[PDB]
Design a protein around this nucleic acid. Structure first.
Lengths: 692, 126
DNA sequence: TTTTTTTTTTTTTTTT
């Protein structure tokens, strides 16, 4: 009948025994989720992975949610095991969950992941109805839940509800006190009366679920609510977060009752609000645990709000690029404008935990006050629905952005970062949610005027955008690398490329001589050489996803899904999609295949030089040298004219070849960005060839 | 000019939500007088003090009588807020318990004995 | 980061 049924019937009566399936039939992956790997023995020297995965392989007849043996998590770290792929299970085992009444669970123990399936059916029935329970939960554990596939700060699954609506709680005889009242009297108040607070800042989710400790929904969010003049950092615990997080927005008047008051956490950093007149109560913090009756948190509509009392309004620090030009090192600010660039979902390993990762994506916000965008570093703000789907041609507003500057290098690094309390939103056509702000009105007027002028901005999506520009002073580049082996070995590049996980980024420096360079037109000589080694690396491959693509609104879902994070569950294509190549490339000049010879003429490597500067840059000398990959603007050409009377990109080609030819035997320290685009595809691109 | 004048006008202009004095200058206490605390809820678990005091500061230009917050009654219980000592207010409100107002002291930093206490400064409010 | 339930409080004014 089906492979699933046959294997399950074959292995049902032998729990915790590994049997090769009687028949090996390719099965389509229809979903891949990630959850904590508790209940495993942490006594083994190779501590089992902090997370395990569940894969919903689907046969022609049924699809039965299986369990991936944690030893196979390598196939998911590299994204080799993705949704829509065909794999051939080689080893299976049966495990029974002792905290649930149900049938056996198939335990995948060895796979041979192949390629994307030709036909994926999302309507195949579920063999075991238990797997079809609407509040989807992991196969193992009693009250477990699925986390987001890659990062841990993004809500995922059905445990996250959005059903909360305003409620009209009568204030007839409700004892409401002020935050300062608790501040002065919270160690003597046996009972803590009700409160009427308003949200000012909502923080990003935080998962504190360790594998050994037994906790349910280890989710914790810090909300800076302010009742009257006072403000405290309320913190929701346990399973309260996945019942109120997707519903509570900044500016909702909450009525908190049956709460707890304690001492401020020692490592807590309460953010200063926009208004300085308020009192920042930083000695005690209100903890909201899930009380049996659902009266602890009640939100009252604005109509029920009474100006008779004083409630701190939600203010903002909207700033333009011109203002940012003078803003100091660290000054939290809000930004708004028309998105003009979207990066990729890069992942940086957390120092706190080498297993967890962040999910950031470089974006550019355009305004009328400057010719450069804000260049925001957008981390995951626990808003996957917006974060993943943002595209250039739209209005984007991000709040609580911290300035970051670096004058050590000539191209001042004036960019922003997303703090813990940073939120993301896409404003309406007129800017309805933020229309009240004056800067918002100015931005909307600018967009309307420019559109009425028949003008469009150069919109780019995804690509290879290493925003951080390596300085021109190799000494400063080394200084930034404090005893971290700034110059990676010529033979270690293989291992470093083998260490990156899905969409991981890392910057290293190599020492060598320019073996040769062949110009690759994006579409005056075409090739040149400088002139038997121990071994050579063939890493000069530029993938189609690496080339930035001009944005076309007609095809926006396709473009946004080609640079997003890999989906957890399958979604059939809505028709026959286009091809990424048919979209024009935002780059104005082609790449190169610079080959590097080792200092000890023993190891060689092939790397790709993908410059971002336009011919306008090499004419105006906005770049550092002809061997750099980023221009001082670090912004894709504004297309003020599209094509100018300047030396054509074909002329800049050949010119770069001869510029490299100048560095015939010169000892150089090139900075080579290395990233793993997914599957086994890995990119190694040049950034800057430091020369003496 | 006069510190009390500036504080009064500031709390009148900006919302009177325990306005923090924009500028803090040492002020000399000229009198501390007590009376019963009538017209109070007296229903909070931490029952309010039975008596309250009305300090009489002097900034060198005018002397204004200010109603001390009952929360700061310990400073007078311990004789830390006496005549002569020059203090520094840090919070101020504008109570109406109305004609003009009642400059309230919500916080204070009692200092050292003053050497220039003047009994000649006229009352700003008659 | 986690973390719940319970209560305790005595005393000198008004007459119209």
């Amino acid at each position: 009948r089906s492979w699933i049924q046959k294997v399950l019937e074959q292995i049902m009566d032998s729990p915790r025994q590994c049997v090769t399936p009687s028949e090996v039939v390719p099965v389509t992956v229809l979903a891949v989720q990630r959850y904590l790997l508790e209940d495993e023995p942490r006594d083994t020297v190779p501590k089992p992975p902090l997370y395990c995965y569940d894969v919903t392989i689907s046969d022609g007849v049924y699809q039965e949610k299986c369990y991936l043996d944690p030893s196979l998590n390598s196939l998911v770290y590299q994204n080799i095991l993705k949704v829509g792929i065909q794999m051939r299970i080689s080893r299976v085992s049966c495990l029974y969950n002792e905290k649930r009444i149900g049938q056996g669970i198939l335990c995948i123990d060895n796979v041979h992941c192949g390629e994307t399936s030709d036909s994926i059916s999302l309507e195949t029935p579920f063999r075991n109805r238990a797997h079809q329970e609407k509040p989807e939960r992991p196969l193992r554990g009693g009250k477990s839940h699925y986390l987001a596939l890659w990062n841990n700060e993004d809500p995922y699954g059905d445990i996250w509800l959005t059903d909360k609506q305003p409620e009209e709680h009568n204030f007839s005889d409700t004892k409401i006190i002020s935050l300062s009242h608790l501040e002065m009297t919270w160690t003597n108040r046996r009972n803590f009366p009700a409160l009427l607070v308003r949200i000012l800042h909502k923080s990003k989710l935080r998962y504190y679920g360790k594998p050994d400790k037994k906790m349910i929904e280890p989710y914790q969010t810090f909300l800076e609510v302010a009742d009257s003049s006072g403000t405290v950092s309320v913190i929701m615990w346990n399973a309260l977060c996945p019942e109120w997080y997707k519903s509570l927005r900044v500016g909702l008047v909450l009525l908190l009752q049956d709460y707890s008051v304690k001492k401020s956490y020692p490592f807590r950093i309460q953010p200063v609000p926009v208004d300085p007149q308020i009192k920042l109560i930083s000695t005690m913090e209100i903890c909201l645990n899930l009380r049996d009756p659902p009266t602890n948190i009640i939100i009252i509509p604005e109509k029920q709000v009474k100006p008779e009392w004083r409630l701190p309004k939600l203010n903002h620090r909207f700033t333009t690029r011109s203002e940012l030009d003078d803003m100091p090192e660290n000054c939290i600010c809000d930004v708004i404008g028309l998105l003009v660039f979207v990066g990729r979902v890069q992942r940086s390993k957390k120092k706190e935990n080498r297993e967890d990762f962040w999910s950031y994506r470089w974006i550019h916000i355009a305004d009328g006050t400057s010719e450069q965008p804000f260049i925001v570093e957008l981390f995951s703000t626990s808003q996957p629905e917006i974060f993943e789907n943002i595209y250039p041609m739209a209005y984007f507003v991000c709040t609580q952005l911290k300035v970051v500057r670096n004058d050590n290098q000539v191209p001042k690094l004036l960019y922003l970062t997303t703090t813990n309390e940073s939120g993301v939103f896409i404003t309406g056509h007129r800017g309805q949610p933020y229309t009240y702000d004056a800067k918002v009105k100015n931005f909307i007027q600018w967009i309307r005027t420019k559109s009425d002028s028949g003008e469009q901005k150069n919109m780019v999506i995804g690509g290879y955008y290493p925003y951080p520009p390596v300085p021109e002073t190799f000494s400063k580049y080394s200084s930034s690398i404090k005893v971290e082996s700034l110059l990676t070995a010529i033979s270690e590049v293989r291992k470093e490329i083998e260490d990156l996980q899905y969409r991981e980024q890392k910057r290293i420096a190599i020492q060598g001589i320019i073996t040769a360079i062949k110009y690759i037109p994006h579409s005056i000589s075409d090739r040149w050489e400088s002139q038997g080694l121990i071994d050579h690396l063939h890493y000069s491959r530029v993938y189609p996803e690496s080339i930035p693509r001009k944005f076309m609104f007609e095809h926006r879902k396709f473009l946004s899904d080609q640079y997003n994070s890999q989906p957890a569950k399958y979604v059939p294509p809505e028709g026959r999609p286009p091809k990424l190549d048919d979209f024009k490339s935002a780059r104005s000049l082609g790449h190169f295949e610079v080959t590097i010879l080792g200092l000890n003429h023993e190891i060689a490597i092939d790397v790709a030089f993908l410059p971002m500067y336009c011919p306008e840059d090499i004419r105006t000398s906005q770049i550092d040298t002809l061997l750099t990959s980023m221009n001082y603007s670090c912004a894709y050409p504004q297309d003020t004219t599209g094509n100018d009377r300047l030396p054509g990109p074909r002329a800049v080609a050949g010119d770069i070849i001869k510029a490299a030819t100048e560095l015939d035997r010169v000892h150089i320290v090139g900075i080579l960005d290395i990233c793993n685009l997914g599957n086994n595809k890995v990119e190694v691109y040049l950034h800057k060839i430091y020369s003496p």
